[PDB]
Design a protein around this nucleic acid. Structure first.
Ligand SMILES: OC[C@H]1O[C@@](CO)(O[C@H]2O[C@H](CO)[C@@H](O)[C@H](O)[C@H]2O)[C@@H](O)[C@@H]1O
Ligand SMILES: OC[C@H]1O[C@@](CO)(O[C@H]2O[C@H](CO)[C@@H](O)[C@H](O)[C@H]2O)[C@@H](O)[C@@H]1O
Ligand SMILES: [Mg+2]
Length: 580
DNA sequence: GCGATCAGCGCGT
DNA sequence: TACGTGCTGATCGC
């Protein structure tokens, strides 16, 4: 049966009660400078639908939106807040965000709409968004009557579900995680996305020309060495050329055919000159297609800025993700790709990019959680952790640690964190399975606390059904009891890794909140631009660098207090690249 | 035939 | 061995 509501042609006092479920609908997936297709309000007085051009033009409604004392319950308030920021309207008073609540309760449900969250509490008097707007090419805003009922039903569900969701969060001891961490962070992420990052499109364009020329040369050389032209970017076609025409050895297969990944090509290089050329071609193409063209496609021509959207309710560990563009995977390891960062510059003249990153936060967190004596002492001495791990598992003095030993000790660390999986380890160190397990065994002997932790955490996951982070974020691990070795093992690794990655996410998130409070207190113009898992990127007047050098590291290091210190390195410069 | 999906790949922490 | 976004191609399905 249809849901009753007033489709108002004008705003009234009733719609401005001090508490309500609010819906400011933005259908475009990328909400930056996007249109708001309709508004719905549900409160003590009833249910209302307002046309955007009407409500947003009304002084009272706008004032109500920005009144922090007028409490609103919503779903994905960040989306609404940013869309409104582009319209010069401030949204305040959001005291409950159903999307974030559902996310904290169970990241695995993939809740991405009101209907999905509501289904968790057996509430189904609301339709999934996809059912209303369609999917992909056929996506479209329906006529007003259909639009209004949907928005009103969503607002109604939020109004009804607020209490049940908050009660379960309290029971999970996650209420403060929502109210004091994720919701305040949501507002900070909205300012970050709205501010955007300025881009030197001319530099990017020039790089594009050079890459295009280099790709041309290499592409011809490749056909020359192959004796024919073919689609190099086709693992299928390239496979026939390498393994059939040139007879190269098949070291690995893919469910669909021959493997041609970089790791495989590396081993094949000695056999034929075409291999190094394909590898080189892959490097250039990655830069050209994914980064140069990728960035130039989303830069706003008017401001030359890119406005990423941080998905705050997606990852199973509590990390954020970045889209359109993804600014969390910009090249840095290889010097050629690193050059791309020279294209990200300050948004104002005489301003600079400042970057601060936690040094080894995952292992410091592990030392804390496992309370491993050797590991805690290592960080208390601020030792090079990889060299120290090498010394321990290879039983040698610091002067006896060779470059290769340290490299493998690093791999073990990079691994211990992701759950002991000799297969993944052996694959990375290009060694055997047993050998990979042998290192692991040596590591636990040097760090018995870590071993006890890994055992205890897995048992705890089995007993409770989930694992938790420092700030009470949780992840359910149903496969922990699976009788399938592989499925169960993966779940055990997740049991081991989630508390580490998840707790590191909690910390930097708290740091962002703390940092913004300090910046405001100090009246600095510096502001956050990006977060990349364990590092924060800001821009500010050149005159604020010295103060930032002391303040940013301190706030990040003092976000939480662990059994070991937290260390933050920092750098600043004229471009993101120079912030090294 | 063409949009939607899958397959393989490589970039980041 | 963890967690993501999203490219070009190949294959799926209306
Ligand atoms: O607005 C971000 C918020 O919306 C969800 C769906 O409720 O994701 C949508 O927006 C993202 C950014 O444009 C897209 O990547 C995604 O495909 C689209 O469904 C949530 O996942 C997210 O928290
Ligand atoms: O020149 C375009 C034409 O060349 C082929 C090979 O016959 O593909 C080449 O060019 C593409 C565009 O950059 C690359 O993606 C591909 O790797 C390279 O071999 C044809 O597929 C294409 O129609
Ligand atoms: Mg770091």
């Amino acid at each position: 049966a249809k849901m009753a509501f007033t489709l108002a042609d004008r705003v009234t006092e009733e719609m401005l009660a001090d508490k309500a479920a609010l819906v400011v609908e933005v259908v475009e997936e990328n909400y930056h400078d996007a249109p708001i297709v309709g508004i719905a309000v549900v409160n003590e007085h009833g249910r209302f639908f307002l046309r955007p051009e009407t409500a947003l033009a009304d002084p009272q409604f706008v004032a109500w939106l920005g009144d922090e004392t007028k409490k609103k319950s919503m779903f994905d308030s960040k989306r609404a807040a940013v869309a409104l920021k582009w319209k010069g309207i401030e949204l305040c008073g959001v005291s409950f965000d159903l999307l974030l609540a559902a996310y904290l309760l169970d990241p695995a449900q993939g809740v991405d709409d009101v209907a999905a969250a509501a289904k968790m509490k057996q509430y189904e008097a609301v339709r999934p968004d996809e059912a209303v707007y369609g999917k992909g090419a056929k996506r479209a805003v329906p006529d007003e009557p259909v639009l209004a009922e949907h928005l009103v039903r969503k607002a109604a569900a939020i109004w009804e579900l607020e209490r049940p969701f908050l009660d379960e969060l309290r029971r999970n001891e996650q209420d403060r995680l929502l109210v004091e961490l994720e919701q305040p962070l949501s507002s900070i992420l909205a300012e970050m996305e709205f501010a955007g990052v300025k881009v030197d499109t001319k530099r990017l364009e020039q790089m594009g020309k050079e890459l295009a020329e280099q790709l041309g040369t290499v592409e011809q050389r490749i056909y020359e060495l192959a004796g024919q032209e073919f689609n190099i970017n086709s693992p299928k076609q390239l496979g026939v050329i390498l393994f059939e025409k040139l007879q190269l050895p098949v070291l690995k297969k893919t469910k669909t055919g021959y493997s041609t990944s970089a790791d495989v090509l590396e081993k094949l290089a000695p056999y034929h000159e075409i291999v190094e050329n394909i590898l080189h071609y892959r490097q250039l193409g990655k830069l050209q297609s994914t980064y140069i063209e990728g960035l130039l496609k989303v830069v706003r021509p008017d401001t030359k800025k890119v406005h990423t959207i941080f998905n705050q309710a997606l990852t199973q560990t509590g990390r954020l993700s970045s889209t359109e563009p993804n600014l969390q995977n910009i090249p840095i390891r290889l010097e050629e790709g690193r050059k791309i960062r020279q294209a990200f510059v300050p948004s104002e003249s005489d301003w600079l990019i400042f970057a601060a990153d936690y040094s080894q936060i995952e292992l410091r967190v592990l030392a804390h959680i496992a309370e491993d004596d050797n590991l805690m002492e290592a960080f208390r001495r601020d030792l090079d952790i990889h060299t120290k791990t090498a010394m321990d598992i290879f039983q040698v003095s610091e002067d006896e640690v060779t470059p290769n030993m340290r490299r493998q000790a690093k791999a073990v660390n990079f691994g211990i964190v992701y759950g002991i999986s000799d297969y993944g380890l052996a694959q990375n160190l290009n060694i055997s399975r047993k050998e990979a397990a042998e290192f692991i065994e040596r590591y636990f002997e040097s760090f018995p606390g870590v071993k006890r932790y890994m055992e205890n955490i897995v048992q705890e996951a089995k007993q409770k059904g989930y694992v938790t982070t420092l700030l009470h974020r949780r992840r359910y691990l149903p496969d922990i009891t699976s009788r399938n070795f592989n499925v169960r093992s993966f779940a055990e690794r997740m049991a081991m890794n989630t508390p580490i990655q998840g707790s590191a996410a909690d910390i930097i998130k708290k740091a962002m909140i703390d940092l913004n409070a300090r910046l405001k207190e100090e009246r600095l113009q510096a502001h956050l631009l990006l977060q990349v898992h364990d590092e924060l990127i800001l821009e500010a007047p050149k005159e604020e660098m010295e103060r930032l050098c002391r303040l940013v590291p301190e706030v990040m290091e003092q976000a939480v207090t662990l059994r070991v210190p937290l260390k933050v390195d920092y750098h600043y410069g004229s471009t993101w690249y120079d912030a090294k």
